[PDB]
């Protein structure tokens, strides 16, 4: 369905709400309140997922671990690897270049 004014209005509000979170967390990092903020805003399993996703991204970029090793060690099965690979390919070049510098 082509976006309607109702759906566009809701999407823009969600976008602004997201940016407000992003800026709140930016500020928290500047005031050394990011750790308690992240504990408030994210559940323990969500925090764990983020930690694991960094490893999945790292290992996809490194290219050394096999699919079976990614599944065993990171819990990342074939569909998770496909999605993570897609996210990497869709990322802007500046992000991919930086991730290569910092994670490898």
Ligand X SMILES: O=C(O)Cc1c[nH]c2ccccc12
By CB under 8 A, name the binding residues for a second copy. Answer: 14, 17-18, 20-22, 24-29, 31, 33-42, 46-48, 50-55, 57, 87-88, 91-92, 94-95, 98, 102-103
Measured CA to CA, the distance from residue 104 to residue 51 in angstroms comes to 16
Q: 100 touches which of ligand X, a second copy, none (CB within 5 to 8 A by kind)? A: none
CA distance 74 to 60: 11
Grouping H, G, I as helix, E, B as strand and the rest as coil, residue 25 is helix
Shortest distance in whole angstroms from residue 13 CB to a second copy: 9
Minimum Å distance from CB 82 to a second copy? 14
Q: Which two tokens stand for residue 53?
A: 């996703």
């Amino acid at each position: 369905a082509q976006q309607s004014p109702y759906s566009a209005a809701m999407a823009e509000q969600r976008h602004q709400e997201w940016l407000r979170f992003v800026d709140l967390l930016k500020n928290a990092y500047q005031n050394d309140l990011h750790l308690p903020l992240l504990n408030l805003m994210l559940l323990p399993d969500e925090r764990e997922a983020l930690g694991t996703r960094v490893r999945i991204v790292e290992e996809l970029l490194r290219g050394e671990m096999s699919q079976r090793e990614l599944k065993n060690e990171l819990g990342a099965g074939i569909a998770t690897i496909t999605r993570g690979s897609n996210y990497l390919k869709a990322a802007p070049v500046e992000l991919r270049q930086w991730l290569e510098e910092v994670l490898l």
